[PDB]
Amino acid sequence: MKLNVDGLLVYFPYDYIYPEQFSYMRELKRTLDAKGHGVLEMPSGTGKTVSLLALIMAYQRAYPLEVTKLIYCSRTVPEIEKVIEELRKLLNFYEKQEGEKLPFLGLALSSRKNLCIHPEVTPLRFGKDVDGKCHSLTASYVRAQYQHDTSLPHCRFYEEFDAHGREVPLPAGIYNLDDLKALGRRQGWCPYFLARYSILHANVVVYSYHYLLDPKIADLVSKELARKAVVVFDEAHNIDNVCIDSMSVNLTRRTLDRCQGNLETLQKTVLRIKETDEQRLRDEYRRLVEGLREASAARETDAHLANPVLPDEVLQEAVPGSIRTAEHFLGFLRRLLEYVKWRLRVQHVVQESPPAFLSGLAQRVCIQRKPLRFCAERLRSLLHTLEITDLADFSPLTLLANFATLVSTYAKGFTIIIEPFDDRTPTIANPILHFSCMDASLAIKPVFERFQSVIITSGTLSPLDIYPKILDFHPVTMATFTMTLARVCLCPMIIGRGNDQVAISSKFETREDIAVIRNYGNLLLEMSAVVPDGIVAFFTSYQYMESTVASWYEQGILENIQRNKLLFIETQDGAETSVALEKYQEACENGRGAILLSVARGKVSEGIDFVHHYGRAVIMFGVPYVYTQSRILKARLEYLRDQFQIRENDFLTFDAMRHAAQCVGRAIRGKTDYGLMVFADKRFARGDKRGKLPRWIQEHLTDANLNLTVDEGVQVAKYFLRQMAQPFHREDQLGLSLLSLEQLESEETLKRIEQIAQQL
Amino acid sequence: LEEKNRMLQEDPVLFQLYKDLVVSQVISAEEFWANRLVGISAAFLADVRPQTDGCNGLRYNLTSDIIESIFRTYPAVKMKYAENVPHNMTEKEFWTRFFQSHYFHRDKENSNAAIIKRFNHHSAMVLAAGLRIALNLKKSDRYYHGPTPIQSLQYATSQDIINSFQSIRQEMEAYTPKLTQVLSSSAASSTITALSPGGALMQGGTQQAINQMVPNDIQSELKHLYVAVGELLRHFWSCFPVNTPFLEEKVVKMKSNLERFQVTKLCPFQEKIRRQYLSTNLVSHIEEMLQTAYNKLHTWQSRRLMKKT
Amino acid sequence: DMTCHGEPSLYNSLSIAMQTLKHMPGHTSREVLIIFSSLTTCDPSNIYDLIKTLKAAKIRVSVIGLSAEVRVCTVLARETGGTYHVILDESHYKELLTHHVSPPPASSSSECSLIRMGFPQHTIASLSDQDAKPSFSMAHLDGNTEPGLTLGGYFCPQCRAKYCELPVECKICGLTLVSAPHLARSYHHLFPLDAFQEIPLEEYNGER
Ligand code: SF4
Ligand SMILES: [Zn+2]
């Protein structure tokens, strides 16, 4: 189907287009006309990705210069696979419509774990082990020696790519990770290195948040990215959390012991190599004194331990002569480790600012800020010059060096929290240091200042103004697309009263209440006896969920629930959790009721998607407020209040509502998909809490369903199921929720589409 | 033999039929028997409870169905039963131990984790054991005159009929109601006589009680003979149409069996009527059916002979 | 007056129906109607293999659920060519039953064979005539109660089998004994009555 959107031709791969999709296309085109960042909110299951890809391809075809390369940032590998499949289908539609294969190249980027073919590295269960083994088999120093000695360890996949894969770029097309692996096996090349080489040639590059948002990994992609590139973020509602985690550093006593052991081993190795050949240290000193640009710009293959976190200005300055000597720097690291351990010896929690800790270290250890600024560079040079292969054992030293570099340069927005006792078990001596970053916007700061435009979209974007404050920027367009439905596919209900009229709440004071647990058990039993097989229940915390399950089993109510439908409960281990999810899906496809009980912060709420028959019923047991005892959360709230005038309670409510919408918003996949939404909490009736829901969900939240009981909720669920299980025809959607080619040409339809969307 | 004998005992009529067909050498037992020839629920633990009677009664009611469900869901229970019953311990002792063991009474983080693991294992075991054309007619007028045969529809004479149509049109144009001309005493008497019992309209009359003329034992014997003949003829017609050479031999054997049955059972029954001199022709229907079958077989044999000419 | 207990077993019922319908001729349509009250069922084996077997057997399965729509039942109905429905109330249930009364349209795989049938008359024997031969009905012989010795009735033209009920296929020779009104009883399906044009009384200037 051909679409005329503001004079631009779009090849829609489907015979029909939603009006919301047309509005999304028009708004995205308007944003592209400004070459600026924009934030849009689109309901899930509406095919927003297809519209985005079609408009981007149309823009590239019309004006390649405006958008030289498309950048897509995702969350999980299945998302990348789905995006690749949809883009391949769109490209096939384009080729069929035009009759020729367009010179279009799309590529998906992943880690070496998802791109290794070497049989020795395959059985490794950890990506870090895979990376270390690959580095050992593909080290630049190892390769040169292997050139004169074939018996030396090597990886033919990278060698053949270097010898043969560089001259011939990949032909225009779209390749999946399995497709890349098959091509590498056919050609004897490594798909990871070939994909890295072909990034500059690929018109579209798709990868995850970690590959670009993390400053440690940013230069692995941003080096082949121009200023006119456009970056796309989908489901980035928790981008701030990812940036904080990337910028956060955690150290433990076992980490300190491992660092001490690896430092002793490194000193012994340095002494041994100096006895064997002292000239290497002199050559390294010459390289450092003459400039670090010579070594970094001449070996692109040594990017295993790249540290692009520091600004480019600091790179020019050389390492001070006091620590240029290998032994001097080893002693410096030893003194730093001893000082860190002595500071961690405190028996109470200490909250410090980076400037105060730096001043204390300078007073005690006589360590100035300037020598500590280049800690990462000196560590990288020392690790590179010693021909170290098994860098996995050296990870704690690298982590400590990166933490020291972060403290020495980055001060504002960071807090050092020293907790010698675990929050869960204070009786256990667990000395842990957290270098918590409260400024996630810095992680996205260069992206705004380098690329042409940034595209941000997510299904949970209820407040349109907090994100510009969170990311510290001013998006050009802030528009939310209201969802128009010919048939009501969602019935969100709030049940704050139990069977015994007990006030349902999820506050930690009322979490231990037996009455609330019994009311939840009765509600689940009635839902199993009434609602279809698909049942998912999101709790607030793992301990609360376990206590609730134990109380249900002791009371015996859970026995009848198991009699009605099979029960599956996730655990902390993801290996058995995947098996439990597979069993749940098989039972739901076998006609036997399966009930899932997960947490709003668990893996289910993160990267699990529900089909129409999987997302029949989603029940949120209370507002998922984060555990406030974490001083990191308190410090972040204080920093946000002192830097953005945002109350801590408001931020906690926003985060909890975002998590709830993420848990519930994945139960709808389109017009033909209908599901039940239940919110078992009286707190949701609060206007401030209720107002923090997505517009496409909040609009359908009828006030008649506000604060119902178990029986009323069951009756409403029965009515909704019976009404929405009736046979329906796609022809009825024409003119109301679905638009054909002729309906698009109607100006009244265009006016309705314009009225559907609202900008804020 | 034991399996075959129990089938006869369950149905005495069939056993009587078996005796009349095999013992009387009408048919062989081989040919006689040639023609003659659960989901798993998760409630098996929660719903099944140790039943407490009025005075210290442990009514276990250990049905094999529940035991098989437990074995399917929990192979460990089956292994323990095999390795302990009945040498290491008795079945009742094993059940008592299971009731008293922590396996049944699963009922704090460790306890919650154990309960969750047990429930997940039970669900996984249950899931694993669950697997182990548009139509356009041409001549619609056939529906206008369907299975009704060609009637006596006769067209009248030429234009003179219209004149007759005029005559009635002129005859009833000036019409007046009449009362005396409608009925007469003689016509009323004739109608009464026609409607009187024994008249032409009152067709026939009373009949004879055939129920008392035929003894009930003779009625039961006739019913048994009817059932046997009907089954034999159903087997005979099942082969028809004969498309394979084996069907020819099977039909020949069926005819031989029918002849043997008629000689051994029908004929002595006939005299049973004839000795009682019952005027009811009950055997006449049997004779008609047997003769129809014999004529059909003879005609098919003649057709087969002609096809080979 | 039965007792409702346990859980439904769709797999066993479908297997029994397929076994019963296995011997049926291809030209005759195989239709299955299922009343599914509970939303969960227990299957001793994989139902999808049974679904494939039913699809190969060309059997139509229609399911009318009571509580809500079942994905497995919907897939089964779609693959078997039947229709899946959900009960809204008693009136909706009656409407669904009335709709399902009408024969489903014949698919492409439906056979077209020229079946032979007989139409015996109501042979009635008079005791005054010497040709009165009372005989028990074959259908009545199947019951435990003593069959009634009827003077006449219906006799099969193919094997002289006596039946007192029509339309009943003859058990002996397999001939389907029907009657002319029985055949014409479905002729209205052949020529459905098209809906008349609706014009309001005010806009219609004609006969009152
Ligand atoms: S070069 Fe490629 S195939 Fe070889 S170990 Fe590294 S990732 Fe694996
Ligand atoms: Zn017959």
UniProtKB/Swiss-Prot annotation, chain A:
Q: Which residues form the Helicase ATP-binding domain?
A: 7-283
Q: Which residues bind [4Fe-4S] cluster?
A: C116, C134, C155, C190
Q: Where is this motif: DEAH box?
A: 234-237
Q: Which organism is it from?
A: Homo sapiens (Human)
Residue span of region Mediates interaction with MMS19? 438-637
UniProt protein name: General transcription and DNA repair factor IIH helicase subunit XPD
Q: What does the UniProt cofactor note say?
A: Binds 1 [4Fe-4S] cluster.
What domain comment accompanies this record?
A: Interacts with GTF2H2/p44 via the C-terminus of this protein; mutations in the C-terminal region of XPD do not alter its helicase activity, but prevent its interaction with and helicase stimulation by GTF2H2/p44.
Swiss-Prot record, chain B:
Q: Name one GO biological process term.
A: transcription initiation at RNA polymerase II promoter
Cystine bridges: none
- Say which domain of life the source belongs to: Eukaryota
The answer to whether keyword Phosphoprotein applies is: yes
Q: Which GO terms describe its cellular component?
A: nucleoplasm; transcription factor TFIIH core complex; transcription factor TFIIH holo complex
Q: How is it modified after translation?
A: (Microbial infection) Upon Rift valley fever virus infection, interacts with NSs leading to ubiquitination by the NSs-FBXO3 E3 ligase and proteasome-dependent degradation.
The alphabetized UniProt keywords are: Acetylation, DNA damage, DNA repair, Host-virus interaction, Nucleus, Phosphoprotein, Repeat, Transcription, Transcription regulation, Ubl conjugation
Domain BSD: where? 1-37, 54-106
A GO molecular-function annotation: chromatin binding
- Where is this protein localized, as stated in its record? Nucleus
The main location class comes to: nucleus
| UniProt function note | Component of the general transcription and DNA repair factor IIH (TFIIH) core complex, which is involved in general and transcription-coupled nucleotide excision repair (NER) of damaged DNA and, when complexed to CAK, in RNA transcription by RNA polymerase II. In NER, TFIIH acts by opening DNA around the lesion to allow the excision of the damaged oligonucleotide and its replacement by a new DNA fragment. In transcription, TFIIH has an essential role in transcription initiation.
**Subunit structure, as described in the record:** Component of the 7-subunit TFIIH core complex composed of XPB/ERCC3, XPD/ERCC2, GTF2H1, GTF2H2, GTF2H3, GTF2H4 and GTF2H5, which is active in NER. The core complex associates with the 3-subunit CDK-activating kinase (CAK) module composed of CCNH/cyclin H, CDK7 and MNAT1 to form the 10-subunit holoenzyme (holo-TFIIH) active in transcription. Interacts with PUF60. (Microbial infection) Interacts with Rift valley fever virus NSs (via OmegaXaV motif); the interaction leads to TFIIH complex proteasomal degradation.
Entry's family note: Belongs to the TFB1 family.
Q: What's this protein's name?
A: General transcription factor IIH subunit 1
Q: Which organism is it from?
A: Homo sapiens
Q: What stretch of the parent protein is included here?
A: 111 to 548 of 548
Swiss-Prot record, chain C:
- What tissues contain this protein? Widely expressed, with higher expression in skeletal muscle.
Keyword Zinc present in the record's keywords: the answer is yes
Q: Which GO terms describe its cellular component?
A: core TFIIH complex portion of holo TFIIH complex; nuclear speck; nucleoplasm; nucleus; transcription factor TFIID complex; transcription factor TFIIH core complex; transcription factor TFIIH holo complex
**C4-type ZnF:** 156-173
Its localization reads: Nucleus
| Keyword Metal-binding recorded | yes
This protein's UniProt keywords:
DNA damage, DNA repair, Host-virus interaction, Metal-binding, Nucleus, Phosphoprotein, Transcription, Transcription regulation, Zinc, Zinc-finger
Kindly state a single biological-process term from the GO annotations of this entry: response to UV
Quote one Gene Ontology molecular function term. Answer: zinc ion binding
Cited function? Component of the general transcription and DNA repair factor IIH (TFIIH) core complex, which is involved in general and transcription-coupled nucleotide excision repair (NER) of damaged DNA and, when complexed to CAK, in RNA transcription by RNA polymerase II. In NER, TFIIH acts by opening DNA around the lesion to allow the excision of the damaged oligonucleotide and its replacement by a new DNA fragment. In transcription, TFIIH has an essential role in transcription initiation.
The record's family statement is: Belongs to the GTF2H2 family.
> Which proteins does it associate with, and in what oligomeric form?
Component of the TFIID-containing RNA polymerase II pre-initiation complex that is composed of TBP and at least GTF2A1, GTF2A2, GTF2E1, GTF2E2, GTF2F1, GTF2H2, GTF2H3, GTF2H4, GTF2H5, GTF2B, TCEA1, ERCC2 and ERCC3. Component of the 7-subunit TFIIH core complex composed of XPB/ERCC3, XPD/ERCC2, GTF2H1, GTF2H2, GTF2H3, GTF2H4 and GTF2H5, which is active in NER. The core complex associates with the 3-subunit CDK-activating kinase (CAK) module composed of CCNH/cyclin H, CDK7 and MNAT1 to form the 10-subunit holoenzyme (holo-TFIIH) active in transcription. (Microbial infection) Interacts with varicella-zoster virus IE63 protein.
Protein name in the entry: General transcription factor IIH subunit 2
